[PDB]
């Protein structure tokens, strides 16, 4: 109801998000497995029957969510600057873009990272993520061959650790002299600097 | 029962772990919140009544678990080589040891990292983790001041990213010319190399 604000007689006033965006919020809160259709119905404010105008159930909503995350990540790999220049130039571009995508698509990427199930959708999403891993590891291998990346760390271990650094951003990053985007740029620049040069002066 | 092995008449044969180690396994599988006393009783193979010889309930078992993880991590900071030499020497030692502890105490550290609750125990564990963070960030600040760590990445962002790299190890690491421990050494060495020098040759 309207709540008194205790200021000159003023009071407060007493679902515009999409079904997908609602579902993603519930999945992050509860975990996918722990989300029921009743949760989703109560959250979206529409009936279980009404949801069939949209999807067959929660797996389809998860699919839509992880597909959006995967499309953005794979998309990076065929962008011009991921595909031209030296292998180390392409790798650095890819790393920067992965940070950008994780910030921009944070809830979707978070769900993708959490997939640990045996539905067909989850197994597909895990397949796709392993393919993406393989792709990036090949870029790092190419940069090592070109002499631009160090040879004393195994390529797949380096790739795993670098992904650990990048993926950690979902845990801590919250969006708020450039008018906008300074905090985002700062994270991208820092990750690039630490990935390629580490902490040492 | 005994299962026929279909080999010359042979067959198979038809809770020695501690309550804490059982509980930790259930908590990792189910999440702490989603674990009930019935789960724990069914897992340990003893009655709910019998568990009172040991603990008041699951919060106390969680406390024991996260206390073990926190004790090992804090322990690092007062080890000799975390406390003598240059700030960058101490930092590097700390980073190496954090990797060692995360591998050795993997389930405990995993639970500590997962704490996202409002029980008194969880809030304590979060306080302690933030204190540990602060400590390590001060080491990095000292190394920057001594001119050994780069100045173009904010100290707390660098620390957050480095912890992201380290903490990621709980997701992927499984234990199996040195007779033992080669895989462990490899991870520690790689993390140290990438943290301090990055990927570039």
Keywords:
homodimer; 201 residues; mainly alpha; Arc Repressor Mutant, subunit A; Tetracycline Repressor, domain 2; 2 domains; 11 helices; DNA-binding (chains A, B)
What is the ordering of alpha helices and beta strands of chain A? HHHHHHHHHHH
The assigned CATH architecture of the largest domain in chain A is Orthogonal Bundle
Radius of gyration of chain A (Å): 21 Å
Helical percent range of chain A? 55-70%
CATH topology of the largest domain in chain A, by name, is: Tetracycline Repressor, domain 2
Briefly, what CATH class of the largest domain in chain A?
A: Mainly Alpha
- Report the span from N to C terminus of chain A: 59 Å
Oligomer: homodimer
Number of helix segments of chain A?
A: 11
Largest sheet of chain A: none
Q: Which structural class do the helices and strands of chain A define? A: mainly alpha
Characterize the overall form of chain A.
Answer: globular
| Largest interface in this structure | A-B, 41 and 41 residues
PDB class: structural genomics, unknown function
Keywords: structural genomics, tetr, transcriptional regulator, unknown function, PSI-2, Protein Structure Initiative, Midwest Center for Structural Genomics, mcsg
Assembly: dimeric
Entry title: Crystal structure of SCO3833, a member of the TetR transcriptional regulator family from Streptomyces coelicolor A3
